[PDB]
Amino acid sequence: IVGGYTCGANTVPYQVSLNSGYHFCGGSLINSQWVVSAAHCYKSGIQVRLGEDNINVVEGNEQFISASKSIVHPSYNSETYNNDIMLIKLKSAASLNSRVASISLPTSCASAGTQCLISGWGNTKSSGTSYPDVLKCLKAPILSDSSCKSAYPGQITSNMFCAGYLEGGKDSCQGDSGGPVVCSGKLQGIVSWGSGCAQKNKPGVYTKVCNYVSWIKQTIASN
Ligand SMILES: N=C(N)c1ccc(O[C@@H]2CO[C@H]3[C@@H]2OC[C@@H]3Oc2cccc(C(=N)N)c2)cc1
Numbered sequence: 001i002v003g004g005y006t007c008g009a010n011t012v013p014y015q016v017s018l019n020s021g022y023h024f025c026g027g028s029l030i031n032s033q034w035v036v037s038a039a040h041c042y043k044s045g046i047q048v049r050l051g052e053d054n055i056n057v058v059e060g061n062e063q064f065i066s067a068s069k070s071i072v073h074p075s076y077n078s079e080t081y082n083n084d085i086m087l088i089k090l091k092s093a094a095s096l097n098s099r100v101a102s103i104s105l106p107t108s109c110a111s112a113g114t115q116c117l118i119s120g121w122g123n124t125k126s127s128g129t130s131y132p133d134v135l136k137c138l139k140a141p142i143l144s145d146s147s148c149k150s151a152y153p154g155q156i157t158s159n160m161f162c163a164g165y166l167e168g169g170k171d172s173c174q175g176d177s178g179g180p181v182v183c184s185g186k187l188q189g190i191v192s193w194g195s196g197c198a199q200k201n202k203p204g205v206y207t208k209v210c211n212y213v214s215w216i217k218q219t220i221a222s223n
Pocket residue numbers: 078079080081082155171172173174175176177191192193194195196197198203204205
């Protein structure tokens with residue numbers, strides 16, 4: 001997250017870190033047994049880490065739980081990142097508490113201008129490299145589809161939306177992928193892609209979760 005702030009320990013209790021020996025992607029807890037992330041974060045051997053703030057220090061509220069299965073969206077395209085969403089099942093149910101909490105799925109899509117909360121442990125530098133060890137947060141609005149499409153001609157589908165600032169300075173970044181975009185208490189987006197980070201006229205692009213609520217609900221009920 002570039003241009004954001006330190007969230008505060010466990011203030012974003014649905015935020016999970018995906019670990020395979022190291023943090024590599026964000027995710028969102030959506031009930032005690034399931035995580036939503038981005039399909040481009042797929043790999044085998046995932047451990048989901050819940051209740052994290054400093055991902056390099058055991059601070060006493062963590063739950064580390066291995067994935068028992070991952071399900072990449074049936075139409076994910078790795079070239080275009082269309083349908084960039086995946087589900088991960090926990091080998092055992094998480095213990096839900098004030099620091100380990102699920103986030104609600106949308107009932108409808110959000111509209112342009114809505115303010116969202118984006119968070120993660122990704123790079124905080126627009127040029128060069130600095131990874132934070134504590135969770136970072138950013139408030140940013142959903143941009144109009146025309147502004148989105150204009151910045152990225154031919155690359156935006158109906159399953160994507162842009163959020164951020166066209167002026168630059170504030171954006172998600174490498175290492176934030178898979179994490180949440182929450183607007184009005186609902187998971188509306190997944191950190192998916194962008195051009196650099198926090199660059200002018202290149203906002204972040206997010207998976208539009210509201211288009212997948214039926215697939216999510218049906219898939220978790222059948223797995
Ligand atoms: N459909 C496409 N045209 C498109 C499809 C895929 C793609 O991937 C390249 C390689 O990975 C890069 C990059 O994208 C993912 C990542 O950079 C990020 C990751 C997370 C957030 C941000 C951000 N600035 N908000 C950037 C790139 C483009």
